[PDB]
Amino acid sequence: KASQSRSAKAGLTFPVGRVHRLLRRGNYAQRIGSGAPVYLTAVLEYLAAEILELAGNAARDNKKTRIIPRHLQLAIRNDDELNKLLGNVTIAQGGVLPNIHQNLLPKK
């Protein structure tokens, strides 16, 4: 009779019932459908996986084993669609990209 959660029923590692709880007492609609928390759980799981993949090779490009928000900031702003998504957000301890305009160099 005992069965496991909906997350591994959908094959997901993010909590489906917790997403359903936050949807129901988040006061967005009075009736919440069944397939909506599974869809939202899959979307947020994929976005987290893509973000951690980008932070992963950004941290391998610095020869380290830990993730600093320098790596997160770099992995955000060298990718164009995350640039478009996260344009107006500022990350804690991020800094800026190394850039210099063409005529400002010692051209000679």
Binding site: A92, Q93, G94, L97, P98, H101, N103, L104
Partner: protein
């Protein structure tokens, strides 16, 4: 001795500060400034250090964005040196009047 071209060690200092991620404003004058500007709206006000930190990172990020926009507007204006009229133009074309 040997000297450097004015405009070459400036690039080394630029690349040093741009690879760096450390904070560039002293903590105690900033905390005095935010307490003296918070005294105007409500007295007997205490503060938390992470709130001061969030305020600090917000203002230097806005200052860095404004300085980059002013640099772009000034090199649009066939010059190298930034002046206050490019600051006024950048704030006018950015929306904040």
């Amino acid at each position: 001795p040997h000297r450097y071209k004015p405009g070459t060690v400036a690039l080394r200092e630029i690349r040093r500060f741009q690879k760096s991620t450390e904070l560039l404003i002293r903590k105690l004058p900033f905390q005095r400034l935010v307490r003296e500007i918070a005294q105007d709206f409500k007295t007997d006000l205490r503060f938390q250090s992470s709130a001061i930190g969030a305020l600090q990172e917000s203002v230097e990020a806005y200052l860095v964005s404004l300085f980059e926009d002013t640099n772009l507007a000034a090199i649009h204006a066939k010059r190298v040196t930034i002046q206050k009229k490019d600051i006024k133009l950048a704030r006018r074309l950015r929306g904040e009047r």
